[PDB]
Design an enzyme around this catalytic site. Structure first.
Site, PDB file in Angstrom:
ATOM      1  N   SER A   1       0.772  -1.119   0.018  1.00 46.21           N
ATOM      2  CA  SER A   1      -0.063   0.005  -0.045  1.00 46.21           C
ATOM      3  C   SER A   1       0.824   1.300   0.148  1.00 46.21           C
ATOM      4  O   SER A   1       1.742   1.292   0.819  1.00 46.21           O
ATOM      5  CB  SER A   1      -0.987  -0.140   1.358  1.00 46.21           C
ATOM      6  N   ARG A   2       0.527   2.309  -0.884  1.00 45.34           N
ATOM      7  CA  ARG A   2       1.208   3.448  -1.100  1.00 45.34           C
ATOM      8  C   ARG A   2       0.807   4.409   0.046  1.00 45.34           C
ATOM      9  O   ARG A   2       1.636   5.444   0.382  1.00 45.34           O
ATOM     10  CB  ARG A   2       1.185   4.182  -2.439  1.00 45.34           C
ATOM     11  N   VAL A   3      -0.038   4.147   0.811  1.00 40.10           N
ATOM     12  CA  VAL A   3      -0.582   5.166   1.691  1.00 40.10           C
ATOM     13  C   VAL A   3       0.116   4.858   3.101  1.00 40.10           C
ATOM     14  O   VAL A   3       0.361   5.908   3.906  1.00 40.10           O
ATOM     15  CB  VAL A   3      -2.175   5.370   2.095  1.00 40.10           C
ATOM     16  N   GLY A   4       0.369   3.686   3.272  1.00 41.82           N
ATOM     17  CA  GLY A   4       1.344   3.247   4.661  1.00 41.82           C
ATOM     18  C   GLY A   4       0.281   3.164   5.939  1.00 41.82           C
ATOM     19  O   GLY A   4      -0.763   2.597   5.580  1.00 41.82           O
TER      20      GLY A   4
END
Ligand SMILES: Nc1ncnc2c1ncn2[C@@H]1O[C@H](COP(=O)(O)OP(=O)(O)OP(=O)(O)O)[C@@H](O)[C@H]1O
Ligand SMILES: Nc1ncnc2c1ncn2[C@@H]1O[C@H](COP(=O)(O)OP(=O)(O)O)[C@@H](O)[C@H]1O
Ligand SMILES: Nc1ncnc2c1ncn2[C@@H]1O[C@H](COP(=O)(O)OP(=O)(O)O)[C@@H](O)[C@H]1O
Ligand SMILES: [Mg+2]
Ligand SMILES: [Mg+2]
Ligand SMILES: [Mg+2]
Lengths: 43, 505, 471, 51, 306, 119, 202
Positions: free
Chosen positions: B370-373
């Site tokens: 996931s790029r949001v973390g």
């Protein structure tokens, strides 16, 4: 003749997964002996 | 060696007097077939405008030439012949939107296909709309509870991000998007409008039996009252399936621009690419790679860029995009697979090897990210499962050492036993979503070593027994994790003492 | 005024054929205005001329709503953009308009986006090194000051995080101004980059800024993505030639410029090339890369990022950009899954400043010794998967342990990746990275473990992590 | 030790002989895939240039 | 002879900024190659300077030695060291021992052409070396005609009584420029998006660099084309056409360059078609015994771990 | 062919190499307007190779032997230029690199060189 | 015998060997060399089937041998590529599978009301390195009732002919055989395939 510099780990199949697990198991056993010897030499 | 337009029939009208009837607002169909329809005339017709034929079939003029006008029919071309009148509506390709569309299975043009009469639309929005800018967007800070224990702790998605769902057939592609819509029933049935998230299933490329089975399961679990169903089967024309992504995004954008949250599910992304290349090949256009159009990557990136989280000055809404990518044998290095993975903020890889063994859903921890973390997840699940991403990588390398003959490593025995119990506890069944209060207690007992003394076969029975005892005895610990959403010093000491005493029956 | 008015005759996709009069037709690369229904305009760049008082133009926006016979006025010149000190801190578009809702750009001059590159006599060669702060970049492939830098990598390897971490430690302390021109990015990446620069002092709304923002992601059509590289490079070229400042152009990504031209090449009357590309791939990529160089008026350190197609360096968009870059930071997808942050290839990355006459005799021996030990470990690892560790002798056993500790010591925690790693960001200097790598290769840190060097800084952080893990 | 060394030589010869048969079968599949990739890439450029 | 010391373009115009060029003749770009009666055997030796190039694959005057290799592995490094090693013969008075270089930079950037010309001037090597500047920022007609224009200027020295040495850097960039102009002229394509005359475009420019006989003047011309391969595959589309037309090829692998071999020159893959006929008699006595020892040690190199 | 029909003699034709004849025929056909075949070959692969191989046969006055050098493309015998020329080849003179320096003049393989007339 | 795609010297030598053993007096020879046009070699399969169909429709048996099936597919693709058509797999048109299935469907056995004759088809497929999963290999195996695989590994060891028991099978070959040969060869096909796998691992 043909290039094969690290072709086992670059494939990612049966031979690639076994090479990474063998190196990680040997490094984990050697880290336990080095950490126990360093703590006893400091005291 | 010659040219089209004026030829034989069209070359005998300009020598006398080609006037009388107007050729700007209407036009004559010179040739039609395979969805395409070359209308001769329509000088006042704009690009991507809705055209109405004399038989009743709708059309969309996408290719405008100097002597003809290539229009794509939205239905069947069996009633359109040569010389038919093609009138222009004067507007572009629009669709209905508003709060009255929740509860009816609409099509690709806004018409109701469920048999509930007309649709109570409050506005008219175009399909090809512009995406949000960098000044009208904020960071993804909200948490989208999907219900799965292996998705909420690893690659957690938030309101406003685009999470892809790559995988093969019969592996868990459509099951991941259906479980996230049914898990929002706890927040949509109340009165908090900021926590509710409306669903928007856009079934494109599916069959007739697959669209009717998914809508019947959501109505029986109290989930179809706040979910938009976009019916777009493969038995229609090529222009109806290709425009299903733009029509479904316009209806979900009305809630994000007012003060509500939306969740779009484009199932699937592989079916939308094949429908766009079929209409472009019949309109006399040059192809690109893999017999597709030139703007293949721009068609999927423009429809996914509009689903972004707005700022506080725009209303405070967001739109979640769930695009499913149908792979062929796990090949993610294709033309349509690599284009959608480099535009979305993360992807969920669904392998076919772990799905057949029983680990449902087969979510690879080493491939899906996931790029949001940790910003798109709740504070309660991030405290008890802070080392969930690091424990999956260490347990995978230690699991392969058991098949080599090594039986030593006394210090690695605790990590190997805890990794097998954590993977079975996070695997949930179909249509069985969990809340944030039940998933925080299950992840704390598997990461602290409390589940290492239990058996592997009793991992399914331990999850139901722990949730039932925390709802009748220590009910104050379960309500504090859902209302506050975090755990301080007093909540951490009470959760550790109750989990240790419950292990001995 | 005698404006060149044209009539729209064809409109299929981004390509729009405009028919004008005889003799009053516009030239190539000319902006054509078109009145729509809103307060904005429809910019259209003339690509080629089909003949018979007609030229095919490429629209830089949405072509929906255009009818046959609309008015198409010609501007007379190319796509003008605002240059100077007024463009710093504002979000400009491909046509030179503001998209930050902060009023109009008060610029005294407006230069065109289409311009010729420098000649061979105006080129100025240099051999200066640029310190970035990473341990793998200051020892292997060093970045050259005033040259072109390429961060090659696949999808999800770390291409976007590498450009954001280097701008927070080099562009914030440089004397010149920055120029972040994103082409083919995402919608969420543009809003996160503007908010991070305001909290660090790079873009001040009420003070002074030194970073030019050029919008233009993948949300527009094919004409705006191909012209995003020419609009962003025009503002950075004026600060190095007219003002004489060391500009820093940050392109993200560089692979989107070649992919945008191939999407409209099929409708313009051109035959396709290899892998579905256009025939003018080497001509369009060389005209834009040669203009972002270092001349006698000023320098320009271009830090672009190349996106490999599904991890493939033999493509036509990745292999053609390797000959116009000094330092190439190629990333691999296999090192990112093992825990190396970031996945910096110690053997695939090469640079022109990795010599003994630029970095010295001491730094040249450390770079050659680290590359020889990493290359020899790949050949020895294949024999251990079939025979085991019994075939290794005393020299082969010590080389396998030193190669694993050297690979984890070069991976340092970035400041922008603190939300995914959890630890704080560390920045190592150029002198501290060369001294720590030479001591580990001699036999001074052979008793330490492999976990003490992973996610650490220099030689000071490796000694503190070993004593805390043993207690 | 002599029996284990003699048995290891027979296992190494069988592994080297089995690797040669697998390399010969993989070379026939790689030769057919290389010719099919050149024909598929040339057919895509010829179809777009003729339309 | 007036073009030595200045960097010219693809049409003959000077771009170095040193005034005009005293041209003694005008030759066409598309010229015919030499026949089978005006050619002799390769007897002269080309001193490259490298110890592994002068003993193994020894190149001679009039032959075509290809410089195959991957990205950053020793492609242009072998061609630059051979032109700078001719300072011991060009600074004297023997006209038959000198060899005028002809570096034809095609497909490179603007910064790469300026760095190569500055290094040769500091070591006294740019006074007798032609530089054909042909960057990728120009049109497709200037880069495709860079091989024919550079071969016509270097042919004047071989037809008078001197020796020349052309270095077409690179051969892969010249093939992309010819296919770009043919695709826009409404022509049918072939393999790898190339025209029908793909093999004839590279064989016509490489056959003109041959060694003449004593009745024609006694001159020769060397052709050093660098074939930029993809990922080490020497059997590609443009790599197999340049290796079959040339009389030898020097391979360069990316694995041997990181081990310690400078430069990475594989002895088992690189070979010369001339043999020991175009080398010195003093170096041929030591190269005979070294060829048998190097071939036997490569096949038994797997026993070094035990 | 004129020495075998008018004078009557067993002539021997040498085409070095055989792979150059198949590649030259596809270059003139692709530049004229014909579409390609497999592996970028010409469509009339079996017609162009059979028109020149059938003329070198045995007549009532003489014969005409052919000793061309067939070159495999990238070590592949199942390609379009290798399988088309092997159907009309009656004999084969394989010269492997195993002998040569071993002490055999010349390097003639007794197991790799096969022929259809050895019955 | 329909020699399609063969050389000129191979067709003349095969006809002389059959006449010396009293076998060319009742056998049709269809000469179709590769030195002619592309239309003559592609129409050799359809012309040979029409001559053999006259005996099956009157009361006689016929046996057609299309040698080879791989040579007929290359001749039909040459005329279609020059007429601006669409090339599919292995540079073949869309009607590649319909050309071989229509010519092989006519070689069937008639009933008693049609004469009682039959026509046998023997098509030879030239594989490229034993690739039985090709475009022209899978199209001929899906329309014929059985195949005879000829491996090149057992042919060089002396086993002539190299007929693989584990690959070659017959659909309508059990009931259309002699009762004396089937009774003496009890489980001959099952014992031959199991003996080859056990001998390779021992
Ligand atoms: N024998 C050698 N010893 C040390 N360094 C070398 C040697 N050969 C080449 N190099 C280094 O390699 C770098 C590139 O060399 P070269 O110019 O031959 O390749 P290149 O043209 O840069 O390759 P590409 O065109 O793929 O970038 C040079 O900067 C040089 O320092
Ligand atoms: N958690 C689960 N437990 C058991 N079975 C599941 C679970 N999730 C999905 N499945 C099975 O996976 C199948 C997926 O079918 P379908 O949606 O048609 O394919 P895809 O998931 O690839 O779109 C369903 O039939 C369902 O039975
Ligand atoms: N230093 C680092 N430590 C840990 N993770 C990192 C680091 N740098 C990058 N990443 C991970 O790499 C991913 C890159 O995502 P994205 O930018 O979408 O793809 P790309 O980098 O190919 O553009 C991020 O999700 C991030 O978690
Ligand atoms: Mg599904
Ligand atoms: Mg990025
Ligand atoms: Mg070079």
């Amino acid at each position: 003749v043909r290039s094969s510099a690290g072709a086992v780990r670059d494939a990612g199949g049966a031979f690639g997964k076994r090479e990474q697990a063998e190196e990680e198991r040997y490094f984990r056993a050697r880290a336990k002996e080095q950490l126990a010897a360093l703590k006893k030499h400091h005291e | 060696k010659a040219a089209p337009t004026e030829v034989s029939s069209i070359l005998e009208s300009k020598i006398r007097v080609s006037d009388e009837a107007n050729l700007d607002e209407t036009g004559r169909v010179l040739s039609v077939g395979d969805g395409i329809a070359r209308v001769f005339g329509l000088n006042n017709c704009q690009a991507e405008e809705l055209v109405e034929f004399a038989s009743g079939v709708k059309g969309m003029a996408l290719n405008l030439e100097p002597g003809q006008v290539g229009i794509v029919l939205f239905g069947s071309d069996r009633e359109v012949k040569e010389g038919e009148i093609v009138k222009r509506t004067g507007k572009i390709v629009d669709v209905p939107i508003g709060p009255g569309m929740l509860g009816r299975v609409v099509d690709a043009l806004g018409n109701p296909i469920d048999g509930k009469g007309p649709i109570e639309a409050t506005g008219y929005a175009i399909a090809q709309l512009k995406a949000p800018g960098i000044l009208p967007r904020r960071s993804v800070f909200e948490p989208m509870q999907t219900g799965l224990k292996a998705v909420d702790a690893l690659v957690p998605i938030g309101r406003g991000q685009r999470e892809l769902i790559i995988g093969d057939r019969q592996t868990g592609k459509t099951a991941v998007a259906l479980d996230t819509i049914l898990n929002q029933k706890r927040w949509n049935d109340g009165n908090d409008e900021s926590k509710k998230l409306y669903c928007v299933y856009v079934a494109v490329g599916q069959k007739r039996s697959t669209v009717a089975q998914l809508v019947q399961t959501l109505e029986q679990n109290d989930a179809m009252k706040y979910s938009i169903v976009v019916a777009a089967t493969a038995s229609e024309a090529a222009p109806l399936q290709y425009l299903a992504p733009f029509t479904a995004c316009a209806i979900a954008e009305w809630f994000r621009d007012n003060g509500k949250h939306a969740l779009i599910v484009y199932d699937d992304l592989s079916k939308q690419a094949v429908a766009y290349r079929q209409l472009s090949l019949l309109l006399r256009r040059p192809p690109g790679r893999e017999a597709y159009p030139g703007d293949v990557f721009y068609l999927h990136s423009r429809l996914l860029e509009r689903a972004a989280k707005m700022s506080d000055a725009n209303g405070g809404g967001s739109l979640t995009a769930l695009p499913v990518i149908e792979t062929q044998g796990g090949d993610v290095s294709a033309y349509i697979p690599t284009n959608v993975i480099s535009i979305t903020d993360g992807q969920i890889f669904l392998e076919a090897e772990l799905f057949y063994k029983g680990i449902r859903p087969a979510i690879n921890v080493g491939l899906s990210v996931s790029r949001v973390g940790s910003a798109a997840q709740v504070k309660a699940m991030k405290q008890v499962a802070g080392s969930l991403k690091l424990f999956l990588a260490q347990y995978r390398e230690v699991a392969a050492f058991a098949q080599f003959g090594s039986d030593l490593d006394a210090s690695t025995k605790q990590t190997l036993s805890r990794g097998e119990r954590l993977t079975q506890l996070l695997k949930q069944k179909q249509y069985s979503p969990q809340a944030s209060e039940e998933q925080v207690p299950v992840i704390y007992a598997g990461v602290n070593g409390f589940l290492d003394n239990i058996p592997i076969e009793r991992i399914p029975e331990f999850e139901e027994q722990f949730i039932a005892y925390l709802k009748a005895n220590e009910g104050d610990i379960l309500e504090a994790i859902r209302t506050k959403g975090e755990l301080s010093s007093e909540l951490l000491d009470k959760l550790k003492s109750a989990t240790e005493t419950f292990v001995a029956t | 005024a005698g404006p060149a008015s044209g009539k729209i005759r064809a409109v299929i996709g981004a390509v729009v054929d405009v028919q004008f009069e005889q003799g009053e037709l516009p030239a190539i690369l000319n902006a054509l205005t078109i009145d729509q229904g809103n307060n904005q305009k429809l910019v259209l760049e003339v690509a080629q001329h089909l003949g018979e008082n007609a030229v095919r133009a490429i629209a830089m926006d949405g072509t929906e709503g255009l009818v046959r016979g609309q008015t198409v006025v010609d501007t007379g010149a190319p796509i003008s953009v605002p240059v100077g000190r007024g463009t710093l801190g504002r979000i400009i578009n491909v046509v030179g308009e503001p998209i930050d809702e902060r009023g109009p750009i008060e610029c005294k001059q407006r230069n065109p986006i289409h311009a010729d590159p420098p000649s061979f006599v105006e080129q100025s060669t240099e051999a200066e090194v640029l310190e970035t702060g990473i341990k793998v970049v200051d020892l292997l492939a060093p970045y050259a000051r005033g040259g072109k830098i390429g961060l090659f990598g696949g999808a999800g390897v770390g291409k976007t995080v590498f450009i954001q971490e280097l701008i927070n430690n080099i562009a914030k302390a440089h004397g010149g101004f920055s120029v972040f021109t994103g082409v083919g990015e995402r919608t969420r990446e543009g809003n996160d980059l503007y908010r991070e620069m305001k909290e660090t002092g790079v873009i001040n709304l009420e003070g002074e800024s030194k970073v030019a923002l050029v919008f233009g992601q993948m949300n527009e059509p094919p004409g705006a993505r191909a012209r995003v590289a020419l609009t962003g490079l025009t503002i950075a070229e004026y600060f190095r030639d007219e003002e004489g400042q060391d500009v820093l152009l940050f392109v993200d990504n560089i692979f989107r410029f070649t992919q945008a031209g191939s999407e409209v090449s099929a409708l313009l009357g051109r035959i396709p090339s290899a892998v579905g590309y256009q025939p003018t791939l080497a001509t369009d990529m060389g005209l834009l890369q040669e203009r972002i160089t270092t001349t006698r008026k000023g320098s320009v350190t271009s830090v672009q990022a190349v996106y490999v197609p599904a991890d493939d360096l033999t493509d036509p968009a990745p292999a053609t950009t390797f000959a116009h870059l000094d330092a190439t930071t190629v990333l691999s997808r296999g090192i990112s899954e093992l825990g190396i942050y970031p996945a910096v290839d110690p053997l695939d990355s090469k640079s022109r400043l990795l010599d003994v006459s630029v970095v010295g005799q001491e730094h040249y021996d450390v770079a050659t010794g680290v590359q020889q030990t990493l290359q020899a470990y790949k050949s020895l690892q294949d024999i251990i998967a079939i025979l085991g560790m019994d075939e290794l002798s005393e020299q082969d056993k010590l080389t396998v342990e030193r190669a694993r500790k050297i690979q984890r010591f070069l991976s340092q925690p970035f400041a922008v990746a603190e939300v995914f790693t959890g630890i704080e960001g560390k920045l190592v200097r150029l002198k501290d990275t060369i001294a720590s790598f030479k001591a580990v290769l001699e036999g001074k840190y052979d008793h330490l473990p492999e976990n003490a060097f992973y996610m650490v800084g220099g030689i000071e952080d490796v000694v503190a992590k070993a004593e805390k893990i043993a207690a | 030790y002599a029996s284990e060394i003699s048995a290891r030589r027979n296992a190494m010869d069988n592994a080297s002989k089995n690797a040669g048969e697998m390399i010969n079968k993989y070379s026939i599949l790689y030769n057919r895939t290389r010719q099919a990739v050149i024909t598929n890439e040339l057919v895509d450029i010829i179809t777009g240039a003729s339309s």
